[PDB]
Amino acid sequence: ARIAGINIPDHKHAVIALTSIYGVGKTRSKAILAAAGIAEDVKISELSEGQIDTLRDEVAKFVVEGDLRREISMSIKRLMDLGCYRGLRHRRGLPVRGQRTKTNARTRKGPRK
Amino acid sequence: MLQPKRTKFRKMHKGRNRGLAQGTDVSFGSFGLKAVGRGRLTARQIEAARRAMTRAVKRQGKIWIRVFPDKPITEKPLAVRMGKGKGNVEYWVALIQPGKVLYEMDGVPEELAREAFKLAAAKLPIKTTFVTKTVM
Amino acid sequence: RSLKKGPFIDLHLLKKVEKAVESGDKKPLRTWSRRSTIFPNMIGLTIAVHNGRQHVPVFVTDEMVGHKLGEFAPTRTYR
Amino acid sequence: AKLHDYYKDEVVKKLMTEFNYNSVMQVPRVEKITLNMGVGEAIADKKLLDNAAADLAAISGQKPLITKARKSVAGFKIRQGYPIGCKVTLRGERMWEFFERLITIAVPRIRDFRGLSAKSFDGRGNYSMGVREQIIFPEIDYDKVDRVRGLDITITTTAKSDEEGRALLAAFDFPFRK
Amino acid sequence: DKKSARIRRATRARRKLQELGATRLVVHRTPRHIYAQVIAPNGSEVLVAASTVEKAIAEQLKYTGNKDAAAAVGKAVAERALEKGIKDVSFDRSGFQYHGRVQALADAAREAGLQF
RNA sequence: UCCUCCUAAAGAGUAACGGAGGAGCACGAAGGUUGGCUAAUCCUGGUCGGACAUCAGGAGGUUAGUGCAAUGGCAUAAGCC
RNA sequence: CGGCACGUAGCGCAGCCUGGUAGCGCACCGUCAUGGGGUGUCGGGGGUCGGAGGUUCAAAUCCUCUCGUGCCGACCA
RNA sequence: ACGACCAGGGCUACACACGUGCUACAAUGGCGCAUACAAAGAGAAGCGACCUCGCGAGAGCAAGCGGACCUCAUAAAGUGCGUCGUAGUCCGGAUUGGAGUCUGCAACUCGACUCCAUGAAGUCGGAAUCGCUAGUAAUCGUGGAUCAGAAUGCCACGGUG
C-alpha cells in the first residue's frame, strides 16, 4: 500500500523511499528491510508481495505519523502549564540547548532583520 | 452640541406650530415640567438646564430630558444682501409646543423637585408649570 | 538535557518529607534545594524552591518531577 | 445499492425502537449530498479550475457545475460574475458508493482520524464535515498534486434534530469522536 | 413546495385569459388522477368536467392516471364540450408544460375538431 | 436644455440667486417571445476560507433586485436564468 | 469671511484627470571604506495619502460633509 | 569593612549589531562494502587491550604498561567495487522530542557524547575585502596540553598535494 500518510515515493531504492515515511528514517528503513528479509537493491517501484505486508506491520510497531506528532506536541504544552524552563522558552521561541542568542539562534528567532 | 450624528439631511424648513401635545406624561420621572407656550430650545438652553438641575438634586434621583432637537434652522450670515442662497446651519432648534414635557426628575421630594426645576427655568424660554407623577 | 539515572532526591527534601508525613500543606516550604525530584507524598504541595534571590512556591505536579524542580523557577527574567 | 438496501432493511428498524412514533415513514432519510470544492480566486482559476473540476469528477461519475459569485465579494474582489467554486449534487447511485468510499476509501485512507467532531447542526440537524485534506482515490491527480486538497461534504438529510442525525449516520458507522 | 410553485405559475395564464373572456380548459394533473374542467365564459361556475374518477371513465382504464385516462378524456373533451356544442375552448395550461398527459387530451381535442 | 422628488396649499399644473440629485447614454441582448426560476439580512454548520468567497440548511418575507439618478411601481412578478 | 487650488514617508512633488498600484529625489537607518568623521560605493525601512466614508468588487482620486494653508477677489460711488 | 566565609544565581542573558573560526550548498560527490599506506606526542586519583554484554556511545571483567616494549591506535581523505542520478535531493545537517551514556553529591539557568526519530536554512553569496610564492596554499585526518568531566579554539604531527 501507500499506508499511513499519503504517498510512498518510487523510481528509487526501497530503503530510501522508506526514509520518506514521516517518522521512519535512515536506520529505521533498512531495519524494516532486515526484518522483512528483503533487499534494497530492488526498488520500492517493484513493491514485493511480501514487503507489502511488513509495510504496515513494522510502521505499526513504531510511533509514527499522527500518533507521534500528537504525543510530542501534547508535551510542548504539558511543561508549559507547569512553569518549566523548556515550557516558556517555546513561546519566546528560544532554544533549550544553551545556544548563542548573543549572536546566533536564527532558527529560533528567525533570520537577521 | 446635540444633533443627528448621521444627518438625515443638512437643512430643513421653518416649520409651523399647530400647538398642543400628545407627549404629556412622565414615563421615567415622577416629577416634571411641561410647557405653556411655544418656541424653540437652541440646545444651549437644554445644556444650561441639565447643568442647573444636577447642581441641586445631587447624586440622588435621576434626570431624563424629553425632546432632542432635530430641526436645524439656518442663519444667513451678516452683511450680505438677502435672498441669494439659503443660509447655513448655526443651530439645532427644538420646536416645542404647549404641554410638551421638557425634563423629568425622580428620586427626590415634591418640594426639592420644584425648587430645582424653578432654578433651571428662566434659562428656559417660555412659561412652565409643574407635573406630579400621576397614577396613570 | 539529562539527569543520568542518578537523579538527586536530596536530603534537604528528606527533612521536609519527615515534617510532611503528618501534615499536608502548612507553609510554603522554604527549600533552597533545587536539584530534587520528589516522592509522591510530597507531590501536591507548595514546594518553595529557591531561585537565587528569594524563593517562589511551586504547585508541583507529577510532570514537574520528571526533571529538577529548579527548572520550574526562572532564575532570570527577560522583557 | 449497498447503503440503499440497508436503509429499507434494518436502519429503519433500529432507529424505530430508539425513537418510536405513531408513524414510520416519518423516519429521517438522507437526501442528496453535495461535494463542494470551492477553488477560489480568479487570477489563473480558469486553468486551476480544470484541475479542481476533474477531482470532483474523480469521486462522482458526472461532471460538476461551477458557481458564479452570489451577493458581494469582499477583499477577494472580482465581481458578481466570475466562476469561482465547483460543486455537484448527488444521485442515490452516487450516494451509496460514496458511502462505501467514506469509510471504505476515506477512513482506511487518511492523514489521521481520531474522529472529527461529536456533533454538527444545521437547523434541522444535518452533519456537514470537512475532510480538511482530500483522500486518495483512483485518480492520476495525486501525481500532479491538486491545488486545494480538501473539500466539504454536507449530507442534507431530512431531520429535525442532530440527536437522530448522528444515529442515522452511525448505522453503517461513521465513527466520529468516540 | 410543489403546491406553492404550481399556484404562482398558473396565476399568469389566469389573468391573460380572464381579460379576453373565454370558455377555458383547465387541466389539473396529479400523479395518480386527472381533474379537467371547463370553466364558464367569465369564470363563476364549471359547466362540464371530467376526471379519472367517473365510472363512465374508468372502464377503458387499466388504472387511474395511466394516459389511457387522457385517452378516455380525449373522448371526454370530445363528449362534454360538444353536448353544450362548445368549441370555444382556450387551453388553460395551469402552469403545466405540454408534455405527457398534458400534451394528451388536448391533441385529442384537435381530433375532435374543437377550435384552437 | 432635459429627467426625478420635495417645496406645491391630498385635481391639475407652479415662483425664487429655494431644498436635493442626475442625463448629454447604453444594449443586438440588457430588445422580443416562450418556458423556467425567486431575494436582502442575519443565524448555524461545513477543507483551503479570513467577520464576510463557495455549499447546505434555518430564520426572515423583499428590509432585495431593477443596464445606469431619484421617486413612484414591480411576486400575476417588469425582476432573474 | 466668500470664491478655488492643494496638503501625500523626515521633507517636497508625481500617481488623481480616466477609482485601485502608491513611485521618485535627497535625507533617516544599516553594511563597507577610512584610524575615525564627513563623503561615497552599497542594502533595507519609511505616507490614518490633511481629517472622513457615501458610491462601489474598488475612493488619495469622483462626489459630499470638513480643517487650516496658499492663492483671487471685499470693488463703482 | 568594596574585607571575610558559605549556599544558590549571574560568567554560556536578549529585541539586536559586529569580528575570528567550523559545516554545507554536491557527483572534482555523498552514502554502503571491503581494502591502501602514517608521522609525532601521552600516561599508576592514568590510558585502558582482551573476553562478555550492549544497535551504540559504552559498561562489566581485567591483562599490560609508569612506558622505541603495553594501552591510547583503528590514521583518515585516498583505492577497487555497490549504488544513488543533479532532485533541495539518496545532498545537508540546524531544531526539537523521546530514549540513553559518562564525570561527579548533584549536570536547573550553563556539560559533552551517543541512539533513534524530526528533519532546518542553504541550490556557492551584492557592495567590499583578506590570506597564501611550495611541501606552501588547498583539503584530509592524527596527537597533545588545560582537561574530574565539555574542543569546530589554541598548540603540534604527518597524508595527498
Query: Which of A3, A6, A10, A71 is most worth mutating to test chain D (most D CB atoms within 10 A of its CB)?
Result: A6
Q: What is the DSSP letter of A47?
A: -
CATH of the domain at E93: 3.30.420.100
Partnered with residue D65 across adjacent β-strands are D87
Print the domain residue range for E81.
Answer: 1-116
The verdict on a CB contact (< 8 Å) between A84 and C67 is yes
Map residue B22 onto helix, strand or coil: coil
Q: Is the CB of A49 under 7 A from strand H?
A: no
CATH class of B21-136: alpha beta
DSSP H helical segments within D26-173, as ranges?
48-59, 92-96, 162-168
In this structure, the strands spanning E89-92 and E23-29 are parallel
Query: Which of the 8 DSSP states describes residue D30?
Result: B
CB A103 under 7 Å to nucleic chain H = yes
Does nucleic acid strand H have an atom less than 7 angstroms from the CB of C28?
Answer: no
How far is B11 from B16, CA to CA, in rounded Å? 16
CA atoms of A71 and B7, how far apart (whole Å):
60
What grid cell was written down for C46?
Answer: 507548595
- Chain A residues lying within 8 Å of C78, measured CB to CB: 92
Any CB–CB contact under 8 A between A96 and chain C? Answer: yes
List the Cα angle B43/B46/B52 in 5-degree steps: 145
Q: What does C1-65 look like in DSSP terms, one character per residue?
A: ---TT-----HHHHHHHTTSSS-SSSS-EEE---S----TTTSSSEEEEE-SSSEEEEE--GGGS
D142 touches A: beta carbon within 8 Å: yes
Distance (Å) from CA C4 to C1' H102? Answer: 9
The grid coordinates of residue D68 equal 458564479
Best CA proximity match to D82, nearest among D53, D51, D49, D37: D49
Which residue's C-alpha is at the least distance from the C1' of F17?
Answer: B84
Helix H or strand E segment including A26: helix A26-35
A76-96 in b/e form (b: 16+ CB < 10 A) is eebbeebbbbbbebbeeebbe
Contact C63 A92 (CB under 8 A): no
Contacts of D102 (CB under 8 A, 6+ apart): D153, D174
Split into its structural domains, chain E has a count of: 1
Give the E-state strand segments of B1-136 in sequence order.
Answer: 31-36, 39-41, 63-65, 74-75, 88-89, 94-96, 103-105, 127-132
Kindly give the residue spans of alpha helices, DSSP state H, lying in D7-154. 12-18, 48-59, 92-96
Is the CB atom of residue C55 positioned under 7 angstroms from any atom of strand H? Answer: no
Distance B89 CA to F11 C1' (A): 37
The torsion of the CA quartet D127, D128, D131, D134, rounded to 10 degrees, works out to 120
Counting beta carbons within 10 angstroms of the beta carbon of residue A29, is it exposed (0 to 12), middle (13 to 18) or buried (19 or more)? Answer: buried
* Element of type H or E holding D152: strand D152-154
Q: Work out the minimum CA distance from D145 to partner chain A, whole angstroms.
A: 11
Proximity of residue D87 CB to strand F below 7 A: yes
Q: Count of alpha carbons within 13 Å of B34, Cβ hemisphere only?
A: 17
Angle at which helix B44-57 crosses helix B110-120, to 10 degrees, equals 140
| Nucleotide in closest CA–C1' contact with A24 | H117
Q: CA torsion E107→E109→E112→E116, rounded to 10°?
A: -100
